[PDB]
Amino acid sequence: AAEFWNEYEDFRSFFKKKFGKDLTGYQRLWAKRIVQGKSFTMVAPTGVGKTTFGMMTALWLARKGKKSALVFPTVTLVKQTLERLQKLADEKVKIFGFYSSMKKEEKEKFEKSFEEDDYHILVFSTQFVSKNREKLSQKRFDFVFVDDVDAVLKASRNIDTLLMMVGIPEEIIRKAFSTIKQGKIYERPKNLKPGILVVSSATAKPRGIRPLLFRDLLNFTVGRVSVARNITHVRISSRSKEKLVELLEIFRDGILIFAQTEEEGKELYEYLKRFKFNVGETWSEFEKNFEDFKVGKINILIGVQAYYGKLTRGVDLPERIKYVIFWGTPSGPDVYTYIQASGRSSRILNGVLVKGVSVIFEEDEEIFESLKTRLLLIAEEEIIEEAEANWKELVHEVEESRRRSER
């Protein structure tokens, strides 16, 4: 249901009349948001009417004299949307588009009204945004629809451009980021009333600190942290293979070791094999070493830190994977790789979010401190020092949480 229902049914009707069919499940949901002036990420598959909704919404906003911008990754998408719009458009609505392979006549029409603010709907690509950041940031759109997600996150300058495009002053963006950098949360001014920002998808390769400005300014998150987690993060201020040996001696079983490089991984594999530990590697034979580890044949599994890796993301065994050890912090620092990797030790099993332990071996105070603040902003989780870690109690929490799971 929706408070502001009257605007929802007014949207619902207009859609069915113009488009011809009724809003779909996702579209209804999205509809109830747009009606309330909430921005959001379109978490849905392809072919369920993502572009159609953005298009129809812009049309519905034009009736009330509100302006929209529709940003696409390709030119053909710009054309196709322009064509569809001008066919569905009424007599009043002013619609203009722009791409490089456009006629000089049609180009000047766009540039004329663009400067004169004589438009209701604008359609251009992500390239256009890169060429016209200055001019764009000087305009406020009630609705901005971004189809390409990576483009938004490729340059920190991009995020700022959209933000200002939705009526968020540059001064407020600086103060917001200045606040977020310190690790605090920024309380946007309640009298600002920004426009609607809608991002079509979520990047399979997110990067940066910038993407957090949507969280405090438009109250939505571009990135895809996990629903929830129960992980204890502990840091070891060195690379002591023997500080490691005495950890494996109490952990004993269900251990994953992520090395920065395949070279350092082999070195670590040699050392542990030399001390007669039951260890296996994943760079040579993954399918077989993981199944042995899965069945209990192998106690320790060593791998290589990679964003979309087999061991970092793919593996799904909360009942088997209890402890995650990082031989050096993922290069970057790569909080998203650390996040995915440490999540192997903690997820829902038979109605219990089991307890997981993540240990980081980092000697570089500088690199570790970066990882710490970033983990705090993204996953709202902290990393404790070895001296605050009660290993016996941690091992207990790991075993006890997997009994309450069997219940």
- What backbone torsions phi and psi does residue 386 show, to the nearest 5 degrees? -50, -35
What CA–CA distance (Å, rounded) separates 56 from 80?
14
Q: Across the strands, what pairs with 281? A: 302
CATH code for the structural domain at 1-223: 3.40.50.300
Task: Give the Cβ contact number of residue 282 at 10 Å.
Answer: 24
In our burial notation (b when 16+ CB lie closer than 10 A, e otherwise), range 12-28 reads beebeeebeeebeebbe
Resolution in Å equals 3.2
Task: Give the Cβ contact number of residue 225 at 10 Å.
Answer: 15
Which class for 311: exposed (0-12), middle (13-18), buried (19 or more C-beta within 10 A)? buried
What CA–CA distance (Å, rounded) separates 371 from 233?
12
Residue pair 114/94 in contact by the 8 Å Cβ criterion: no
Q: Characterise 307 by phi-psi region: left (phi > 0), alpha (psi -120 to 50), beta (else).
A: alpha
In our burial notation (b when 16+ CB lie closer than 10 A, e otherwise), range 196-205 reads bbbbbbebee
Q: Characterise 356 by phi-psi region: left (phi > 0), alpha (psi -120 to 50), beta (else).
A: beta
**Going by C-beta distance under 8 Å and a sequence separation of 6 or more, which residues neighbour residue 34?**
11, 57, 143, 196, 198
Delimit the domains of the chain by residue range: 1-223, 224-407
The reply to whether 1-223 and 224-407 are identical in fold is yes
Q: At what angle do helices 241-251 and 262-274 cross, to 10 degrees?
A: 60
What CA–CA distance (Å, rounded) separates 121 from 95?
5
Residue pair 303/265 in contact by the 8 Å Cβ criterion: yes
Record the tokens describing residue 70, joined without a space.
């529709």
Residue pair 342/232 in contact by the 8 Å Cβ criterion: no
Question: Yes or no: is domain 224-407 CATH 3.40.50.300?
Answer: yes
Instruction: Say which experimental method was used.
Output: X-ray
Record the tokens describing residue 281, joined without a space.
């590697």
- In the chain the first and final C-alpha atoms are separated, in Å, by 37
User: Could you write out the three-class secondary structure of the chain?
Assistant: CCCCHHHHHHHHHHHHHHCCCCCCHHHHHHHHHHCCCCCEECCCCCCCCHHHHHHHHHHHHHCCCCCEEEEECCHHHHHHHHHHHHHHCCCCCCEEEECCCCCHHHHHHHHHHHHHCCCCEEEEEHHHHHHCHHHHCCCCCCEEEECCCHHHHHCHHHHHHHHHHCCCCHHHHHHHHHHHHCCCCCCCCCCCCCCEEEECCCCCCCCCCHHHHHHHHCCCCCCCCCCCCCEEEEEECCCCHHHHHHHHHHHCCCEEEEECCHHHHHHHHHHHHHCCCCEEECCCCHHHHHHHHHHCCCCEEEEECCCCCHHHHHCCCCCCCCEEEEECCCCCCCHHHHHHHHHHHCCECCCCECCEEEEEECCCHHHHHHHHHHHHHHCCCCEEEHHHCCHHHHHHHHHHHCHHHHC
Residue pair 200/210 in contact by the 8 Å Cβ criterion: no
Residue pair 214/162 in contact by the 8 Å Cβ criterion: no
